[PDB]
Scaffold this active site. Structure first.
Site, short mmCIF file in Angstrom:
data_model
loop_
_atom_site.label_atom_id
_atom_site.label_comp_id
_atom_site.label_asym_id
_atom_site.label_seq_id
_atom_site.Cartn_x
_atom_site.Cartn_y
_atom_site.Cartn_z
N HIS A 45 0.85 -1.18 0.00
CA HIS A 45 0.00 0.00 0.00
C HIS A 45 0.89 1.23 0.00
O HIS A 45 2.11 1.14 0.11
CB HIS A 45 -0.94 0.00 1.20
N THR A 72 2.46 1.73 11.08
CA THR A 72 2.26 3.18 11.12
C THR A 72 0.79 3.58 11.20
O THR A 72 0.48 4.78 11.17
CB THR A 72 2.94 3.90 9.96
ZN LIG Z 1 2.11 1.77 5.53
#
Ligand SMILES: [Zn+2]
Length: 257
Positions: free
Chosen positions: A91, A195
């Site tokens: 991604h 994250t």
């Molecule tokens: Zn990421």
């Protein structure tokens, strides 16, 4: 529900995910004046010749390209890693304009986007078991630098209009992730986290020194996605990046002099 807006964005994630203030959070700023060359670090081995992409999905936070991870075909080995890590998905993170979008920074420099190729350690059996372990994931972070159009991205760009809103997915076979790699596989590495929530501290980060290109027009296509789903107010999917977090007691190592 967490997100990237003013009310539910990174600054507020610690309320529901207290590990957001943990000891090994990502991303981080890579200071090239302090990251130490470790001559013992091995070359990265990226084996993607037999990767099988399956679909592409808007999950309301980014878009994910998912791979078959049943076998040791598409795998990452070497570098700082012990054993074999299977590719499961990739991604991106990107900005509302070309001047920001990356999660990692290099001497505080932000790139227009950042690609995360996510792999899990086969010693743990599947992704869901691996994310519970400090050495469960290996993520290859690759910066996207605005410049010439990247033919390796075009098949992704061309399908995004079919997954504009949260929950939409599309078949996405025969995508070659080798087209997303730079020529040099020199890297920095450090121990960190996902994250996004749940922000688990299960990642060996491997951030490549060399960016790949992207044209302004290509990254404008990312910004035509929406965070929202059916019946929700329209909200463009932009600035889906977490800012850099304290390095604390960690060392960033460089594979190159
Ligand atoms: Zn990421």
């Amino acid at each position: 529900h967490w997100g990237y807006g003013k009310h539910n964005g990174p600054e507020h994630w610690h309320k529901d995910f207290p590990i957001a203030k943990g000891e090994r959070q990502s991303p981080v700023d890579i200071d090239t004046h302090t990251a130490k060359y470790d001559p013992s670090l091995k070359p990265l081995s990226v084996s993607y010749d037999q990767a099988t992409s399956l679909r592409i999905l808007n999950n309301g936070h980014t878009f994910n390209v998912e791979f078959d991870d049943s076998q040791d075909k598409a795998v990452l080995k070497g570098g700082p890693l012990d054993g074999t890590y299977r590719l499961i998905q990739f991604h991106f993170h990107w900005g509302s304009h070309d001047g920001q979008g990356s999660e990692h920074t290099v001497d505080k420099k932000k790139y227009a986007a950042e690609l995360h190729l996510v792999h899990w350690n086969t010693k743990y059996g599947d992704f869901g078991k691996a994310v519970q372990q400090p050495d469960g994931l290996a993520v290859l972070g690759i910066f996207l630098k605005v410049g010439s159009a990247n033919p390796g991205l075009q098949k992704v760009v061309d399908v995004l209009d079919s997954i504009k809103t949260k929950g939409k997915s599309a078949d996405f076979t025969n995508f070659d992730p080798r087209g997303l790699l730079p020529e040099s596989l020199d890297y920095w590495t450090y121990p960190g986290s996902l994250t996004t929530p749940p922000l688990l501290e299960c990642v060996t980060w491997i951030v490549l020194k060399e960016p790949i290109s992207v044209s302004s027009e290509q990254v404008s296509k990312f910004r035509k996605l929406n965070f929202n789903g059916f019946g929700e107010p329209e909200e463009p999917m932009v600035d889906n990046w977490r800012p850099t977090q304290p390095l604390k007691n960690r060392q960033i190592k460089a594979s190159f002099k």
